[PDB]
Nucleic acid binder design. Structure first.
Ligand SMILES: O=c1cc[nH]c(=O)[nH]1
Length: 223
DNA sequence: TGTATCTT
DNA sequence: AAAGATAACA
C-alpha cells in the first residue's frame, strides 16, 4: 500500500520518467525544505485512493489545494474531521441544499463519501505554499493533471466533468465535448461564488446526465 | 484581515 | 508576469 492507488499508478506510470514530472517533484521537495506545503506528502495523491480509475463516473475539478493549516488532504474542497468546512465548501453545501431536495449540511467537511462513489475530486494544481493561493501553478502540475483528464477522456465514455473556476476550465480543450458532458461555472470561493456557482445546479444535472447514459446516480448525501 | 476574476 | 481594480460578506 502507498500514495498512488493500484489502478492509477498502472495508467499514470508513463509520466514518472518524464522531465517535467521529475523536475516538478524536485521543486515541491525544495519548497518543503524552506516553507510549509499543503497537503502533506502522503496526502497529495489521496484522489487516487478512493476508487478504481475505471470506476470514475464524475470529475470535479478545482483550482489548487486549501492554503491554511490542517485543511487540504488531497481531495478537492474536502477537509477531514474535526476541521470545519472552509468558506468554499460552505457555499458548495448551500448550493447542494437548493439543488438537491434531501441534502442538509452534514456537520463535517469530509468528501470521501463522494469519492468512493466514483467522483474524482481533483485540482488542476496539487500542492500549494502556505497562505499563498495558486503559488504552485505553472510548475508542472497542469501537465500531470492534463494526463489524468486525457486518460479518462480516451478510455471512458459518458463522464460528467464539473470545471469550477478559470484555472479548472483550461482543461476544457482536453475533453471531447460530444463523448463526455462538460459543465462549467465559477469557483465556489466567496470571491467568485456570485458569478454563476449559486444557481448552477451541477449536482442534479450530473445525476440526470448519468441516468441518460445508463449509469447509477451519485448520492450527494452519502458522506 | 481573510476567502476569484477581469483589466492594465 | 504581476499588480491594481472589482466585488461580496460573517
Ligand atoms: O481543494 C480545493 C480547495 C480550494 N479551492 C480549490 O479549487 N480546491
Amino acid at each position: 500500500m502507498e500514495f498512488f492507488g493500484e489502478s492509477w499508478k498502472k495508467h499514470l506510470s508513463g509520466e514518472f520518467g518524464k522531465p517535467y514530472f521529475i523536475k516538478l517533484m524536485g521543486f515541491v521537495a525544495e519548497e518543503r525544505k524552506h516553507y510549509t506545503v499543503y497537503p502533506p506528502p502522503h496526502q497529495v495523491f489521496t484522489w487516487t485512493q478512493m476508487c478504481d480509475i475505471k470506476d470514475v463516473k464524475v470529475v470535479i475539478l478545482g483550482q489548487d489545494p486549501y492554503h491554511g493549516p490542517n485543511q487540504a488532504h488531497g481531495l478537492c474542497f474536502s477537509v477531514q474531521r474535526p476541521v470545519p468546512p472552509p468558506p468554499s465548501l460552505e457555499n458548495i453545501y448551500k448550493e447542494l441544499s437548493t439543488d438537491i431536495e434531501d441534502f442538509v449540511h452534514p456537520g463535517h467537511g469530509d468528501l470521501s463519501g463522494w469519492a468512493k462513489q466514483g467522483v474524482l475530486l481533483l485540482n488542476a494544481v496539487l500542492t500549494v505554499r502556505a497562505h499563498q493561493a495558486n503559488s504552485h501553478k505553472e510548475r508542472g502540475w497542469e501537465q500531470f493533471t492534463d494526463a489524468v483528464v486525457s486518460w479518462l477522456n480516451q478510455n471512458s465514455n459518458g463522464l460528467v466533468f464539473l470545471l469550477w473556476g478559470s484555472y479548472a476550465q483550461k482543461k476544457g480543450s482536453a475533453i471531447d465535448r460530444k463523448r463526455h458532458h462538460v459543465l462549467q461555472t465559477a469557483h465556489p470561493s466567496p470571491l467568485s461564488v456570485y458569478r454563476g456557482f449559486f444557481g448552477c445546479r451541477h449536482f442534479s444535472k450530473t445525476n440526470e446526465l448519468l441516468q441518460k447514459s445508463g449509469k447509477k446516480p451519485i448520492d450527494w448525501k452519502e458522506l
